Design a protein around this ligand. Structure first.
Ligand SMILES: Cc1cc2c(cc1C)N(C[C@H](O)[C@H](O)[C@H](O)COP(=O)(O)OP(=O)(O)OC[C@H]1O[C@@H](n3cnc4c(N)ncnc43)[C@H](O)[C@@H]1O)c1[nH]c(=O)[nH]c(=O)c1N2
Ligand SMILES: Cc1cc2c(cc1C)N(C[C@H](O)[C@H](O)[C@H](O)COP(=O)(O)OP(=O)(O)OC[C@H]1O[C@@H](n3cnc4c(N)ncnc43)[C@H](O)[C@@H]1O)c1[nH]c(=O)[nH]c(=O)c1N2
Ligand SMILES: CC(=O)N[C@H]1[C@@H](OP(=O)(O)OP(=O)(O)OC[C@H]2O[C@@H](n3ccc(=O)[nH]c3=O)[C@H](O)[C@@H]2O)O[C@H](CO)[C@H](O)[C@@H]1O
Ligand SMILES: CC(=O)N[C@H]1[C@@H](OP(=O)(O)OP(=O)(O)OC[C@H]2O[C@@H](n3ccc(=O)[nH]c3=O)[C@H](O)[C@@H]2O)O[C@H](CO)[C@H](O)[C@@H]1O
Ligand code: NA
Ligand code: NA
Lengths: 386, 386
């Protein structure tokens, strides 16, 4: 045949399935991608004026404690020593973030020893007890108290979800968001970095295999009947939207979307840090990314006087609006449940597997998606190709 | 012979000379050390109560941009990903450090954009111009202005040198100590970490060679006549005090010393950060080190309820007081100059080379000393042993 496997979508999930089939089973793999580029939402490209790498589907920071995933991805790219850090803007002051001795000092007026801060939090938060909380505002206050909740969580959360926090499931805060030290690494994971030559270069390296064919600008649904005809029981990994596959025959799955406002400013440096969160309601956006700071190791190939920034806005996804985050109203998880048995059927019906964030309606970090793909490869696909 | 080279001292300098001679030239090397342990001032050991590694000759943070040195030392040990950061205590508040957008925000009351802060510094510092400054207080103010100078430099400097800053050479500040971003990595070097199994283990690995013999608890001057007798033109690398070698026949070289007050507290965490600088005069010490934070990767082998801290005090070195930092009064650098031709003579006289911080009266970072040793090995010793 000309191919042994078809992969719909070229995000990390599809790519990982592809690469494994090509390199490990030596099979011929056709990848079909709807967009103009490889990569799915992890894709980055250079802003034209400055040459600075930007991510057009949201900033992507890579981090894992899964050694298997880490060793895997380093096959395709090297990473930088970048450690992610975030600052939080509130009442004209950039606060250290997340909540720890750093923020506590700036906000409450003086230094608290680690023990002093535990005690501080005990009082501040003893108003509501965590088992008698009903919504999100309560659950938060019950954990960290009102002054902190109202300054660093209330408006930020409301912006991100377009909703009053009193109207949100108390289940959305599960642990204490406070550190009793000065450690402000954003992520707690073993391995962390950015792809040295950017995401696009990395993603491309995954598909660069003598057994992998890629057709960009190709909707699966327009060419499925044709391609399956050419080799009828080559199996398919589908990583497109799950509900769309079954023609919304059980209703439209609810996503949150993001709008990105991207300016080139005529300064070398706009905030002197990769990400600045904006926590007060008087700003429409949740945060601003200044991308040159994501790769300081390149500063001598960066414009000395311009910088590309990008403001992030959040709202509910309508038609054509990119799906980013699943919403998961209970009136969402029920039509999921029905689609999963539709799919399971379709998997034993027509050898079509469903994976990745769109095809399972699930938020996945990059390492999570890659792990998910590697799982499906080893447990489902190795058998499906012999 | 029983040895081909004698090395006086087992600090990084001596060790590096030793290892190179043993492994590269295959020579027999006798190392003579006065103290009870290997390592010189880089030596660390476990505090007995807690088991936490402490450095008894001052905290040692390893950092370099010299690839040669870095590749070398990794022969003998692995490093952690530790990145050094420092906070500065002033008027009951822990400030982000060094001076950058972080500190500027906390101290001046609100956030300054990078451009906003450059401008802020331009005004603040325009009082004195840097070419018309006479002492240290002036030179500092001329660069960053009075409010900052007086809050973060004045008392700190005076503590460290036991002197009013007006009475200090203006030459001691050479560049702008300010960052116009939020980056608070303490060191700007390519490579940085702590030895994974501690310094002692590292230092020991260097001397662990089938060609290297080590005699601890042995003063060179007590055994020189005897050992040189056994092989009379085996050469000597001397890394002990330079003036003491020549029996202070040109006067006593002036050092600053350090006093270390080391307590075990009954808390798991005393300041929640490796190092806290104390900048106000109302505290005798310059800073406090809390050593468990130097190695967070070990926290499950660290006492959950005790922590070893250590306060650092500074004054001028009298007899027997450990020499740490050279003072370099002009009435110090002149008796140096005389000792260097004494030594150069002694080198062509009796094949005795002088190296390392004590034998050259020079502050050396660890990578600097190692580089210095590797230089002397390649340029002086390879010829001296054929
Ligand atoms: C805003 C935001 C920010 C981040 C992140 C996500 C989001 C939403 N990520 C997560 C990351 O984006 C995620 O792990 C990957 O998108 C998952 O790759 P997938 O293969 O699952 O889907 P993905 O959506 O990337 O790939 C699917 C591909 O299939 C294509 N396709 C769809 N329908 C098709 C059809 N009918 N025919 C053909 N092609 C079709 C799409 O065009 C797309 O290229 C992240 N993770 C992390 O670890 N750290 C981070 O910092 C971030 N940041
Ligand atoms: C307070 C402080 C703090 C730091 C540092 C220094 C100081 C003073 N260091 C620098 C580091 O200590 C320095 O690089 C090494 O001490 C240099 O090793 P040497 O071989 O030159 O001398 P070092 O003094 O270490 O070795 C000399 C040895 O010779 C022995 N000796 C002396 N006379 C003798 C005799 N007569 N006979 C036999 N033996 C004799 C001594 O007992 C000692 O063991 C540092 N650097 C860095 O990169 N990062 C850091 O964070 C720090 N921190
Ligand atoms: C870029 C990306 O993939 N982001 C996702 C990732 O972490 P992120 O670190 O990007 O999380 P986020 O900043 O988007 O915030 C997550 C939640 O934390 C709260 N919050 C956060 C920041 C702040 O300044 N104040 C505040 O209150 C708020 O309730 C918010 O909904 O995983 C999260 C789950 O843990 C969410 O899925 C995020 O969308
Ligand atoms: C542990 C160690 O080996 N330290 C040495 C190392 O850097 P260190 O980072 O340890 O420097 P340090 O903190 O001892 O300070 C160096 C100088 O900077 C000024 N200062 C520093 C900190 C602060 O909070 N406020 C302030 O004013 C002050 O004038 C002081 O004399 O190299 C320095 C030279 O660059 C000195 O040789 C230090 O002794
Ligand atoms: Na509570
Ligand atoms: Na000036």
């Amino acid at each position: 045949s000309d191919f042994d496997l078809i992969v719909v979508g070229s995000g990390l999930f599809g790519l990982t399935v592809a690469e494994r089939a090509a390199s490990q089973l030596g099979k011929k793999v056709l990848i079909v991608e709807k967009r103009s580029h490889l990569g799915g939402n992890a894709y980055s490209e250079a802003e034209p004026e400055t040459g600075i790498e930007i991510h057009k589907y949201g900033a992507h920071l890579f981090h894992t404690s899964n050694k298997r995933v880490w060793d895997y991805v380093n096959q395709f790219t090297a990473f930088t020593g970048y450690q992610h850090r975030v600052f939080a803007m509130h009442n004209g002051t950039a606060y250290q973030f997340p909540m720890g001795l750093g923020l506590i000092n700036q906000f409450f007026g003086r230094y608290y020893t680690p023990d002093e801060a535990r005690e501080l939090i005990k009082e501040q938060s003893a108003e509501i007890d965590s088992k008698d909380a009903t919504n999100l505002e309560e659950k938060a206050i019950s954990l960290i108290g009102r002054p902190l909740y109202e300054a660093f969580i209330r408006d930020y959360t409301a912006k991100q979800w377009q909703t009053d926090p009193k109207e949100l499931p108390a289940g959305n805060i599960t642990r204490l968001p406070v550190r009793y030290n000065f450690d402000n690494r954003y992520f707690n994971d073993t391995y962390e970095g950015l792809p040295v030559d950017g995401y696009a270069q990395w993603l491309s390296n995954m598909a660069d295999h003598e057994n992998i064919e890629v057709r960009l600008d190709t909707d699966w649904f327009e060419v499925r009947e044709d391609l399956r005809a050419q080799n009828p029981e080559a199996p398919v990994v589908y990583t497109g939207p799950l509900d769309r596959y079954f023609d919304y025959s059980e209703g439209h799955l609810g996503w949150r979307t993001l709008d990105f406002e991207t300016e080139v400013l005529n300064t070398g440096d706009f905030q002197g840090t990769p990400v600045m969160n904006y926590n007060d309601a008087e700003f429409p956006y949740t945060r601003i990314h200044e991308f040159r700071h994501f790769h300081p190791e390149r500063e001598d190939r960066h414009p000395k006087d311009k910088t590309v920034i990008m403001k992030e806005y959040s709202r509910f996804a309508e038609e054509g609006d990119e799906p980013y985050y699943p919403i998961n109203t209970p009136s969402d998880r029920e039509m999921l449940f029905k689609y999963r048995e539709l799919a399971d059927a379709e998997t034993e019906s027509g050898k079509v597997y469903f994976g990745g964030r769109l095809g399972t309606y699930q938020y996945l970090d990059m390492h999570m998606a890659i792990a998910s793909a590697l799982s499906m490869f080893d447990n489902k696909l190795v058998d499906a190709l012999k």
